[PDB]
Amino acid sequence: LLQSTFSVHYLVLKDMCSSILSLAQSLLHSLDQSIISFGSLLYKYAFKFFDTYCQQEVVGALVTHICSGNEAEVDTALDVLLELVVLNPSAMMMNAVFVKGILDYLDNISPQQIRKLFYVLSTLAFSKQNEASSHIQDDMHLVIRKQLSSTVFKYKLIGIIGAVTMAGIMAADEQCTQVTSLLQLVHSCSEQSPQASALYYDEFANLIQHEKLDPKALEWVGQTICNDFQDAFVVDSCVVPEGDFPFPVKALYGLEEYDTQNGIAINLLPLLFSQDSPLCLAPYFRLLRLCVERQHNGNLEEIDGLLDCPIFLTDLEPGEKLESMSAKERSFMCSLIFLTLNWFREIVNAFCQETSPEMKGKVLTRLKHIVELQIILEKYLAVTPDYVPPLGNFDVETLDITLLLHNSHAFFRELDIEVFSILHCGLVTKFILLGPPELLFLLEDLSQKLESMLTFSHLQQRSAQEIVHCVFQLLTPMCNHLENIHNYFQCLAAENHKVQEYHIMSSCYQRLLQIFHGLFAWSGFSQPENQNLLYSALHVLSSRLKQGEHSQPLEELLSQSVHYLQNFHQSIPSFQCALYLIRLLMVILEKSQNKEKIASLARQFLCRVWPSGDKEKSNISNDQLHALLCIYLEHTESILKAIEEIAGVGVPELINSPSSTFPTLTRHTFVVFFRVMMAELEK
C-alpha cells in the first residue's frame, strides 16, 4: 500500500517531506518490528522519490539514529543505509560528511553493527567517481590505526573488524599494497594478543567464505599462511621432541593406514607448554581450508596429510592415576583435548563434501574420534567443573565473552550445514545386525541449529528459507532410510523381548522427531510460496508406503503421509518423543472431521504403557503430560463427560494398581492429570 501510495502520488506528497520524516522517526522509536519496518520503508521512499534536500534530511536523520540510537534502531538505520548506498550511491556521496562523522561516535556502537558500518563507509569510499573526496579513507585509516595500536582488546577488535572489512571491499596493484600493508599491520598488532590473532583469522576466513574478490591479495597471503602453518605446527614424525615434559609424548590419534615412520605430525603439547599461537590452530586451518578450496576448487590434494596425521599429544588414557593432579596441568590437559576437538571439528567440516568412499571412511573415523574425545573430556570436566579452558568462537562468541550445553554451542567451532551430507550413507547396527553416537552428535547439532534459526555465526548469513530448503534435501529423503532402519531395529528389539546402544538410539529418535517438529512447524509454510515444497516434501513421506500416485490433491498427500508416519507409534520407547510425534501430526494436519485422527491417536498414546524404567518414568515430567493431556482433552467432543471418564477411572487408581487401568496414573501423575482436567474445564 505504502509502495503504491508513494510510487503513484509522489507529487502530492513532495511538499510534506518534513512531516513524513517526523512520522518515520516516531516509528523507529517503537518496538513491534512491523512498525519499525514501516518507518524504515518511509525513510527509504522519502529518500528515493523526493528532491536532494529531503535526501540530505533523511541521511541526517538516520545518522542521528545510529549515533544517538538504541540497538534495533541503530541496526535498522544501518540496514537502510545499505539499501540507500545500493540504490543511489551518487546522491549519498554528496551526504558523505554526515556518514564520515559517525566515526567520532563509535562508543555507542556494538561490533556486529561496526562490520555493517564499515561496509557502508567503504562501499561509499571505493567508487572511483568521487576520488576527490577521499577524506573518508584518511579518517577510516586513522581510526583503524588508533584502535589497532591499543592494549585494550575492546578497541583492538574494532580495529581488526573495520580493517579486514575495508580489505574485503577494496578487493573487487596499489590497492593490493594497501591491503597487504593493512593486514600485516593487523597481524603485527594481533601477534604479541592470542585472541586478537584468532579474531583476525576467523573474520578473514568468514570474509573469504561469504565473498570469494580478485585473488591477488589472497595468493599474496596464502604463500605466507601455508609456510607459517607448515613450520608453526607441522613437525616431522619424530616420537619425542626436545623440551622437559612430565608426560609421555607420543603421536596419538593417527588413522593407522598411515605409515608411522613418516612426515606430518601436529605439535600441540610442546607449544602450550612453551606458552606456560596454539589457540589459532582451528581458525588458521579454516583459513587454510577456505583459501585452498578457492584455489584448487574443492581439491585438498596437499592437505589430505592433515586429515590423517597423528597429533603430538600426551597419553590421553582416562587419567585416574593423574588425580589429586588438579593443578594448572589439569587445565593443560582439558584445554589440550578441547583444542584438538576444535581441530577435529574443522577437519570433518572440511572433508565431508568429498565423495571418495575411503575418504568418507577416514572422515567417519574422525567423527568417532571426536565423540571418544568428547566423553573423555566430559570425564576430565567431571573431575573439575571450575577449570574453564575459555576459548570461544572468535567471530561473535569471544567478543560476547570478552556446563556441557554452554561449551557445546558457545566454545567449540561451529559445524557447517554440509556436515550433514554424511548421513546420506546408511546406518549399521552393532547389537542386532557409522555408529549411534556418531548419529547422536550430528542430530544434537541439527536440533540446536533449527531451534535457534527458525523460532551461531556462519549459519545466520544463510536465510532461514535456504536452510530449510537444503534440510528438505539433506535430511528427509536421506534420513528416511535411517528412520525406517530405526523402525526395523526397534521392531526386532520388540519381537526379541548393550543398554547404551538402545539408549543412544532412543535419544537419536527423540532428536529426529524434534527436528521434524522444528521443520514442519515452519511459519514460512503459512506463506503461499513454500507449499510447492510441501507438495515435494510430504509426497516423499507418502512414497515410503507406495509410489505411483503422482500429482495428487493436497489432503490426499496429507492422508497418505500421516498414514505412513502414524505406524511408528508402536515403536516409540519414551514419552517426550511421542509428544514430539503427535505435535508433528498436529501441525502438519492443520494444512487440511479432523479431530478423530488426533484424539484416537492421543488415546492410543494415553492407553500405551510408556514403560516404568526409572530414568524413563523420570522422562514423564509435569509439563509434558500437561501438554499431551491438554491436546487429548481439547480434541475429545465430550470434554466434561471425558472429565467424568477420568474421574470415573480416577477413583479406581487407588483400587487396582497404585499405573492404573488408564496408564500414566500414579500418585505423582494426579497433579498433572488434575491440572489438565480442570484447565480444559476452564477453557
Binding site: 542521528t64 554526515f98 585509516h141 590505526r145 588508533k146 589497532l148 595500536s149 603485527s188
Partner: protein
C-alpha cells in the same frame, strides 16, 4: 646493506640481531634515509627486524629505539615520502610505543612539545603518535620522580596548553585530544587555549575547529565551548556594526557554526539544555547581554529539533516582552536615562536577524515565522472585542507583524505559509478580535501585490468562505 638484515631476520630472533647490533654501532639515520629513498616496504621490514632484534628488557636496544624514533619522527614530516610508507611508519611507531620505561616516553613527549612551540612541523603528521604516548603514560605505573605516569600526563598537558601553539596546528592539536582519556580540568585547559586561539586565525578555519571542540565537549566542558563561540561571534557582529556606523564571509561562517551546534544537539540532547540554560532571560527578571543576533539566530535554528521547539519559542517570547517593560521604565523617567548607557534591545536584534537571514539561512527563517505568529497569537488584543497588560503586549504584537512582514518581503518561499496562515486566522476565528491580522494582511498586500500574484490562490480560496463571515470582517 639491508638484504643481510632481512636474511638474519628471516629464521629466528635474539640470536644474531642482538649480536649484529653490537657490530654496526652508528649510522642508522642514513640507513633509513637510503631505505625510504629506495623502497618503504623494506623500511617497514627493517623496522620490524630492529624492533624484534632490540627488546626493551635489555638497555642497548632502547637507545637504538629512541634514536630511530627521532629519525622517523623528523623524516615523516620533513622527508617528502609517498603516503603508504608514511602510514606504515606512523602505525609501526604507534604500535611499538608501549614497551619502554617512563623517562624515554617522557622525553619523547617533551621533544614533541619543544617542537610544536618552536620547531617547524613541516606537515604535523607526527602528531598522531603523540596521544598514544600520553595514553601509555596514563597506564605506565612504573614510578618516575621530578610521580605517577598520569601526573606526568597532567604536567605535560599543562605545559602544552600553557605554551604557545602555532596557528597551523590548532585543528590537529584539538583532534589529537579526542583520543586521550581526559578529566574535566585537562579538557577545560585544552578548550580554553583553543578558544583563546580564535582571534589569530582565518575565519574559515574556525568552523572545523568548532566541530572538533563540540565532539571533544562530550567529555566535560559544554558551557565553555558554547560561551566561547557565542562570545566571539557576538563581538565580531558588534565590531561590524561599529565599522558600518568580509558580509557573505561572516554570514556563511555563522551559517555553519549554527548547523554544527544544531547537529551536535541532535546527537547530544544535553548540549541543547546547556544552550537554553545559558541564554534564558527570565533568571528573575533581567535581560542578559549574552543575547545577540548570533545567539538568537542559533535559537531559531534549534526550533527545528522537535524536542526544543516549544522551549525555545517560550524563551524568545519572554525575552521580547521583558525588553519592552524595561524600555518603558527608562523612557518614563529621566533619573534612569542619566545613568544607563543606551543598550540594544531584543527588538532591534530580531529585526537585525531578519536582515542577516536573506543569504542562505533558511534554517532560521521557519522559526522566525513561528515566533511571529506566537507573538501575534498570544499578545494580540482581546480587551476590546492600563499600561502593562496593553502596551508591552501591543508592542509585541507589532513586533510579530514586523517580523512577518520583513520575513515575507525577502524570503520568497514563506509567502504561501504566512499568507495562508494569516487567512486561516481571519476566516476561522471571527469571534475573537482579528484586527491585528487584517492590519498585517493589508500591510502584506499594500507592500507588494506584485509579489502576491505568485501566491494568489490562497486568497481566492478564502472568497468561498465569505458568506459565513460577519459583515464587518467582510468589509475589512
Amino acid at each position: 646493506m639491508d638484504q643481510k638484515i632481512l636474511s638474519l631476520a628471516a629464521e629466528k630472533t635474539a640470536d644474531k640481531l642482538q649480536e649484529f647490533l653490537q657490530t654496526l654501532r652508528e649510522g642508522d639515520l642514513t640507513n633509513l634515509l637510503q631505505n625510504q629513498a629506495v623502497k618503504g616496504k623494506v623500511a617497514g621490514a627493517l623496522l620490524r627486524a630492529i624492533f624484534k632484534g632490540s627488546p626493551c628488557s635489555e638497555e642497548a636496544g632502547t637507545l637504538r629505539r629512541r634514536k630511530i624514533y627521532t629519525c622517523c619522527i623528523q623524516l615523516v614530516e620533513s622527508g617528502d615520502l609517498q603516503k603508504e610508507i608514511v602510514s606504515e611508519i606512523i602505525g609501526l611507531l604507534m604500535l611499538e610505543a608501549h614497551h619502554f620505561p617512563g623517562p624515554l616516553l617522557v622525553e619523547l613527549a617533551n621533544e614533541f612539545i619543544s617542537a610544536v612551540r618552536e620547531g617547524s612541523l613541516v606537515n604535523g603528521k607526527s602528531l598522531e603518535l603523540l596521544p598514544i604516548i600520553l595514553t601509555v603514560l596514563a597506564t605506565k605505573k612504573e614510578n618516575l620522580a621530578y610521580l605517577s605516569g598520569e601526573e606526568c600526563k597532567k604536567q605535560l598537558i599543562n605545559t602544552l596548553c600553557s605554551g604557545r601553539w602555532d596557528q597551523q596546528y590548532v585543528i590537529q592539536l584539538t583532534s589529537m585530544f579526542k583520543d586521550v582519556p581526559l578529566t574535566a580540568e585537562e579538557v577545560e585547559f585544552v578548550v580554553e587555549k583553543a578558544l583563546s586561539m580564535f582571534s589569530k586565525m582565518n575565519l574559515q578555519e574556525i568552523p572545523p575547529l568548532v566541530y572538533q571542540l563540540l565532539v571533544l565537549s562530550s567529555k566535560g566542558s559544554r558551557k565553555s565551548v558554547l560561551e566561547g563561540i557565542i562570545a566571539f561571534f557576538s563581538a565580531l557582529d558588534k565590531q561590524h556594526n561599529e565599522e558600518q556606523s568580509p558580509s557573505g564571509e561572516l554570514r556563511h561562517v555563522e551559517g555553519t557554526i549554527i548547523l554544527h551546534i544544531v547537529f551536535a544537539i541532535k546527537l547530544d540532547y544535553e548540549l541543547g539544555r546547556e544552550l537554553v540554560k545559558h541564554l534564558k532571560v527570565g533568571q528573575q527578571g533581567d535581560s542578559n547581554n549574552n543575547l545577540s543576533p548570533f545567539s538568537i539566530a542559533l535559537l531559531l535554528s534549534v526550533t527545528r529539533i522537535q524536542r526544543f521547539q516549544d522551549q525555545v519559542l517560550d524563551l524568545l517570547k519572554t525575552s521580547v516582552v521583558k525588553s519592552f517593560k524595561d524600555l518603558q521604565l527608562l523612557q518614563g523617567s529621566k533619573f534612569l536615562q542619566n545613568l544607563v548607557p543606551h543598550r540594544s534591545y531584543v527588538s532591534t536584534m530580531i529585526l537585525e536577524v531578519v536582515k542577516n537571514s536573506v543569504h542562505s539561512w533558511d534554517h532560521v527563517t521557519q522559526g522566525l515565522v513561528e515566533l511571529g505568529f506566537i507573538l501575534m497569537d498570544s499578545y494580540g488584543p482581546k480587551k476590546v472585542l492600563p499600561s502593562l497588560s496593553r502596551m508591552p503586549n501591543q508592542h509585541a504584537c507589532k513586533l510579530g507583524a514586523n517580523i512577518l512582514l520583513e520575513t515575507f518581503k525577502i524570503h520568497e518561499m514563506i509567502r504561501q505559509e504566512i499568507l495562508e496562515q494569516v487567512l486561516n486566522r481571519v476566516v476561522t476565528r471571527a469571534s475573537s478580535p482579528i484586527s491585528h491580522f487584517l492590519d498585517l494582511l493589508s500591510n502584506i498586500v499594500m507592500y507588494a501585490p506584485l509579489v502576491l500574484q505568485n501566491c494568489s490562490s490562497k486568497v481566492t480560496e478564502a472568497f468561498d468562505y465569505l458568506s459565513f463571515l460577519p459583515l464587518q470582517t467582510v468589509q475589512r
